[PDB]
């Protein structure tokens, strides 16, 4: 009975982890969409071609 309860508590935390991560990246996508910059875009390109 105590093993059954602790296991469901551990499941609830991993469930809650599944909930935030999806909506977090789906929000972070919008930070790109509203915080991307052409100098930062050029910074990405110029960085990777220098280490390709």
């Amino acid at each position: 009975a105590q093993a059954e309860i602790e296991a469901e508590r551990k499941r609830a935390r991993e469930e809650l982890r599944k909930q935030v991560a999806i909506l977090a990246v789906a929000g972070a996508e919008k930070i790109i969409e509203r915080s991307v910059d052409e100098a930062a875009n050029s910074d990405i390109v110029d960085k990777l071609v220098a280490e390709l």
């Binding site: 009975a1 105590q2 059954e4 309860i5």
Partner: protein, 52 residues
């Protein structure tokens, strides 16, 4: 006299042996009741704890 005495022995032994078997049957009835009641009490604790 000797023949009667030997037959009286075999009655006494056989009767005691049979009484031992019904003594054992009643202990099995108690055992099977005590363990079934243990399971039926324990489940009503587990369900109460997990519902809590």
């Amino acid at each position: 006299d000797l023949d009667l005495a030997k037959a009286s022995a075999t009655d006494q032994l056989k009767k005691a042996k049979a009484e031992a078997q019904v003594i054992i049957e009643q202990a099995n009835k108690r055992r099977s009741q005590i363990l079934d009641e243990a399971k039926a009490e324990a489940e009503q604790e587990r369900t109460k704890i997990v519902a809590q």
